[PDB]
Amino acid sequence: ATFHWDDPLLLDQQLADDERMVRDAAHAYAQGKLAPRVTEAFRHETTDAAIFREMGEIGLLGPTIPEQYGGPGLDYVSYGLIAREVERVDSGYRSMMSVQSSLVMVPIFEFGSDAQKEKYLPKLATGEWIGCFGLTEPPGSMVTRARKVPGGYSLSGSKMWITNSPIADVFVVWAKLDEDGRDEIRGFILEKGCKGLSAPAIHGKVGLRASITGEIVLDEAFVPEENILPHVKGLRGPFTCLNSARYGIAWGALGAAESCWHIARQYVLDRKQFGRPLAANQLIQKKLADMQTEITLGLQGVLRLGRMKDEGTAAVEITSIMKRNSCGKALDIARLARDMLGGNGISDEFGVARHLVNLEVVNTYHDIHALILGRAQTGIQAF
Ligand SMILES: CN1CCN(C)c2cc(CN)ccc21
């Protein structure tokens, strides 16, 4: 009976009560604690490690990790809802969280020994320990290498653009290990302090400036026998992690899109031209209709995918659909909002220009998703 412009399909009514509470709690935290930081943190590339303990203590880290290991044992829909509330403020904040959850806690939980899971998960869940994921190098063609030696492994190689690394306590590092007749990617857990490991910070970034990033440099770093992930070998290792992170990013990007939309709408409401508000312009109306439309549909898409993952009916290709669409439409929206603004950086509306440069990086983390889908439709590979 009543129209809700900000939620046309009443996504709010499609959610379970525990999901709603999880969403409202993430919203209260993001707006209450991340929003006051973000303008200055982005402008100056401020490092604030204290954020992990804030997130971990309300159960924002590793949302799907079971209570046995300190997680809040929430479903995929809750995870997406959290990502969306945090990225509503800033993608850099979302990125801290998605690394901790999908790139660190997930491989340890899924592939780790009982011993690894009890040691690492509870502190990753509270944010007492900060994690990072060492995959990218400066996948099938990585060069970081583990050598078998008395008592474990010796690692040499370099990882680049590693979110959290200069503040990380725990490092999940992927490296080739040839043993028996097979050279295969394996995962190793390293700890801050380990000899032959350093994590210099990278500064002067264009986007994601509110998030600290660095390298992982390994110079014959020794890893105890019980720090190798026993239950995974090859591409499946990192792929399981990225698939999980992509799902969170599919939701997150829509939160940033909604911020640029709301800023755009408020701006045209406040501004007048030719004696009428800008909101009276026909073309402005079309842009606002487009923004509303793509966000509204994108949300139905990620909600449905979440529901499918929770019931185990979701193939991995569906994540490619939603990841590509959320990131691509969020970027279009950020650009459409940007091109509506006539100023140059002083006013509140230039919050849009921050989301924009953030989404420009996120979108580049090749169009491989279109190729995954193309192969799934045709049976023919073009990658
Ligand atoms: C002419 N014009 C219009 C508005 N605008 C943002 C701008 C900004 C600069 C340099 N920041 C120079 C010219 C203009």
Numbering used by the authors: 4 to 141, 147 to 373, 377 to 394
Kindly provide excerpts from the paper associated with this entry.
Glutaryl-CoA dehydrogenase (GCDH) is an acyl-CoA dehydro­genase (ACDH) which catalyzes an intermediate step in the metabolic breakdown of lysine and tryptophan. Unlike other flavoproteins within this family, GCDH (EC 1.3.99.7) performs α,β-dehydrogenation as well as decarboxylation of its sub­strate glutaryl-CoA to yield the product crotonyl-CoA. Transfer of electrons from the glutaryl-CoA precursor to the electron-transfer flavoprotein is mediated by the cofactor flavin adenine dinucleotide (FAD) in both prokaryotic and eukaryotic electron-transport chains. Like other ACDHs, GCDH from B. pseudomallei (BpGCDH) exists as a homotetramer with tetrahedral symmetry and possesses an overall fold similar to that of the human enzyme.
Additional structures of BpGCDH resulting from this effort were obtained by soaking apo BpGCDH crystals in drops containing our Fragments of Life (FOL) ligand collection prior to data collection. All fragments identified by screening which bind BpGCDH occupy the pockets that bind the glutaryl and flavin moieties of the substrate and cofactor, respectively. In three of the four ligand-bound complexes fragment molecules occupy the binding site for the terminal glutamate of the glutaryl-coenzyme A substrate. The crystallographic water coordinated to the Arg97 side chain in the apo structure of BpGCDH remains in place when FOL544 is bound, but is displaced by FOL239 and FOL6421. In all three of these cases the Tyr373 side chain is rotated approximately 90° from its position in both the apo BpGCDH structure and the human ternary complex. This new position appears to facilitate ligand binding by providing a parallel aromatic surface that aligns with the heteroaromatic rings of all three fragments. However, a conserved backbone deviation is observed between the structure of apo BpGCDH and those of all four fragment-bound complexes in this same region. In all four fragment-bound structures Thr376 and His377 are flipped out of the α-helix observed in the apo state, partially occupying the binding pocket for the adenosine moiety of FAD. This perturbation results in a new orientation of the catalytic YEG motif. Thus, the binding of small metabolite-like ligands induces a conformation in apo crystals of BpGCDH that partially fills the FAD-binding site with protein residues.
